[PDB]
Design an enzyme around this catalytic site. Structure first.
Site, mmCIF file in Angstrom:
data_model
loop_
_atom_site.group_PDB
_atom_site.id
_atom_site.type_symbol
_atom_site.label_atom_id
_atom_site.label_comp_id
_atom_site.label_asym_id
_atom_site.label_seq_id
_atom_site.Cartn_x
_atom_site.Cartn_y
_atom_site.Cartn_z
ATOM 1 N N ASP A 168 -41.815 98.462 -63.503
ATOM 2 C CA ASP A 168 -42.449 99.782 -63.476
ATOM 3 C C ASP A 168 -41.874 100.624 -62.345
ATOM 4 O O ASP A 168 -41.656 100.122 -61.232
ATOM 5 C CB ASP A 168 -43.969 99.624 -63.316
ATOM 6 C CG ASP A 168 -44.720 100.956 -63.372
ATOM 7 O OD1 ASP A 168 -44.902 101.507 -64.485
ATOM 8 O OD2 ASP A 168 -45.142 101.444 -62.300
ATOM 9 N N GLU A 208 -37.954 100.494 -66.253
ATOM 10 C CA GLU A 208 -38.597 101.769 -66.509
ATOM 11 C C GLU A 208 -38.039 102.831 -65.581
ATOM 12 O O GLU A 208 -38.601 103.090 -64.509
ATOM 13 C CB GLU A 208 -40.118 101.703 -66.361
ATOM 14 C CG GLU A 208 -40.786 102.875 -67.067
ATOM 15 C CD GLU A 208 -41.933 103.523 -66.304
ATOM 16 O OE1 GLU A 208 -42.370 103.019 -65.247
ATOM 17 O OE2 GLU A 208 -42.420 104.554 -66.798
#
Length: 628
Positions: free
Chosen positions: A286, A328
């Site tokens: 993330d 990401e």
């Protein structure tokens, strides 16, 4: 700088002479010893480039690698089999067999026990890969939908227990499905133990976050920082109750972990080994660009960020070979690819293709998509795209202005149009979305809404169903791992009641995060309903993809169709795909098709198609033509 052999004997220095000799002769250690030899020099080089002559580097590394071994020793034996299997098949993520799903455990299935029950449905759909949205303990009320982590080990009580999750992971493996969970490594919630202890000034947790006495530094940083959630606060900083300022890239209750401190690397590597031994196949890395900070820069995509991720990678190569990384990076395309490598993140999200999929629906013109597919699609060996249509997030218009410029497109103006179009503020627009993070000072805006809402299913636009078919086909066939946002396969619309939940009303992303529609799922078998049409459409394309080796790998070549509405590309010199983005019939000319065989079988419609004459695609039609 120390070496692999030095650290290995220092690891065994915890054992007494008697047991040490037994450990050294074991299979677990032999494998660990081999992987240490192969992968340690990378780990050392990577960490050295970030930390240099840092006092704490060697002790940190000794402590980390001591855990690595203990973690590997305790690693479940069936996971060790997967470890060996992926060491031998680094390209498993590149296989056309892979089709991925993603859902929130609660919204889709109630809880973890209920999720395990939905596995038969996942096998019915044909999924081989399942991302479960953030699962762990987080603040009550607002938590950026679980992305504010209060513990990386304690499951959200509302979803169940750590036990349930292991049971879910096991059952998924029994069904031939990989488990994918978030590694929210840039930040924790402000209720995370490390936060409370750092802020309280516990010396054990000194420099775990970036906390400042006043606005002097924050003011200077902000001069060059992007504002991700401008609705929430300006710049990159939030004020504490005591008057100090903490680095908060996202929400105020999300505190950036401080990677300038090597003990933060160690702490997060320990958390990674934990998720690994749960049996996780792929960690979603993330907010990869955010993990390194430097005054006078945008504090995104910095060299040290890449190095740390490569350091994390090496850790897995040593103590958990099966664990792959999904990047990401929702940033400029030149930056997106830079995270994608075998020794960094083996796969990454493809925000470029997703955004241009939607662009093309709005403009009816394939120019940017064709450009992106021609110059930016192919990746280094042993790496793949994650291609998607929608996600839990807003749609951001992340095409390159430079690329747009070569086409005589002004990026600024084009985003104005795209945003207006998808929030139903452009004449005749079929889209029913809502703004996300309109920024009055930059003109930037993003789009919330489901795939069904954005193609016009809410008002029953006659083309809605075909549009969904068209978008998913490109994601399923361009090359890379396709990720279906669960709910899309039955045409799930918006939750128009997001704005009346006061924990949600400031985040339009809930519009497209509705609870499982049971009425729609009951219709998936009925071709008269849109849910049925969408379902069998998608289920067909999945089937074709998984059984036809023409789809294998990630390489593609663009085919110039000589029609501004029609996308064209070739897979493996054997598959020719056409996608009509016009709502009118569009022709691929006989002259254009001169070099193709005179006839080819269409995997979509099932018919055989003539290519020695003009080829006219119906509105939004997609053809997958076997040309070899």
């Amino acid at each position: 700088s120390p070496n692999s052999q030095y650290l290995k004997t220092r690891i065994l220095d915890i054992y007494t002479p008697e047991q040490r000799a037994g450990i050294e002769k074991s299979e677990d250690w032999r494998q660990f010893s081999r992987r240490m030899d192969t992968h340690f020099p990378k780990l050392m080089n990577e960490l050295d480039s970030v930390y240099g002559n840092n006092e704490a580097l060697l002790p940190m590394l000794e402590m980390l690698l001591a855990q690595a071994w203990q973690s590997y020793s305790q690693r479940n034996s069936s996971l060790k089999d997967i470890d060996i299997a992926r060491e031998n098949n680094p390209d498993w993520i590149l296989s056309n067999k892979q089709v991925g799903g993603v859902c929130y455990v609660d919204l889709f299935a109630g809880d973890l026990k209920g999720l395990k029950d939905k596995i038969p449905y996942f096998q019915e759909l044909g999924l081989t890969y399942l991302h479960l949205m953030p699962l762990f303990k987080c603040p009550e009320g607002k938590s950026d939908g679980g992305y504010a982590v209060s513990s990386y080990r304690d499951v959200n009580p509302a979803l169940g227990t750590i036990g349930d999750l292991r049971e879910v992971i096991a059952a998924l493996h029994e069904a031939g499905i990989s488990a994918v969970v978030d590694f929210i490594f840039n930040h924790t919630s402000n209720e995370h133990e490390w936060a409370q202890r750092c802020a309280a000034g516990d010396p054990l947790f000194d420099n775990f976050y970036y906390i400042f006495p006043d606005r002097r530094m924050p003011d200077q940083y902000d001069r060059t920082l992007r504002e991700i959630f401008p609705d929430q606060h300006p710049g990159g900083f939030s004020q504490l109750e005591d008057g100090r300022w903490v680095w908060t890239t996202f929400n105020s209750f999300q505190w950036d972990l401080n990677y300038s401190n090597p003990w933060v690397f160690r702490a997060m590597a320990g958390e990674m080994l934990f998720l690994a031994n749960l049996g996780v196949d792929i960690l979603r890395m993330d907010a990869v660009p955010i993990i390194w900070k430097q005054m006078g820069t945008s504090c995104e995509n910095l060299p040290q960020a890449h190095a740390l991720i490569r350091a994390f990678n090496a850790v897995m190569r040593i103590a958990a070979p099966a664990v792959f990384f999904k990047s990401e990076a929702i940033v400029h395309p030149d930056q997106v690819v830079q995270y994608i490598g075998q020794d960094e993140c083996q796969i990454g999200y493809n925000p470029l293709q997703m955004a241009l999929l939607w662009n093309t629906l709005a403009t009816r013109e394939v120019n940017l998509l064709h450009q992106a597919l021609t110059y930016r699609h192919n990746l280094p060996e042993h790496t793949a795209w994650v291609n998607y249509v929608r996600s839990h997030d807003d749609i951001g218009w992340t095409f390159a202005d430079e690329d747009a410029a070569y086409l005589g497109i002004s990026g600024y103006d084009h985003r104005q149009f795209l945003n207006r179009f998808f929030v139903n503020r452009f004449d005749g627009s079929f889209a029913r979305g809502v703004p996300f993070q309109y920024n009055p000072s930059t003109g930037d805006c993003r789009v919330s809404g489901t795939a069904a809402a954005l193609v016009g299913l809410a008002q029953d636009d006659p083309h809605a169903v075909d549009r969904i078919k068209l978008l998913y086909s490109i994601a399923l066939s361009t090359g890379g791992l396709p990720l279906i946002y669960l709910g899309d396969e039955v045409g799930t619309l918006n939750d128009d009641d997001w704005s009346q939940d006061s924990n949600k009303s400031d985040d339009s992303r809930w519009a497209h995060r509705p609870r499982y529609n049971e009425a729609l799922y009951a219709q998936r078998n009925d071709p008269s309903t849109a849910a049925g049409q969408i379902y069998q459409d998608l289920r067909h394309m999945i089937a074709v993809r998984q059984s036809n080796p023409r789809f294998d790998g990630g390489r593609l070549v663009t085919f110039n169709t000589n029609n501004k509405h029609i996308i064209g590309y070739i897979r493996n010199n054997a598959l020719l795909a056409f996608g009509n983005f016009s709502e009118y019939p569009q022709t691929v000319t006989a002259h254009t098709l001169q070099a193709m065989p005179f006839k080819a079988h269409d995997l979509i419609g099932g018919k055989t198609v003539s290519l020695n004459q003009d080829l006219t695609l119906q509105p939004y039609q997609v053809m997958w033509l076997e040309i070899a």
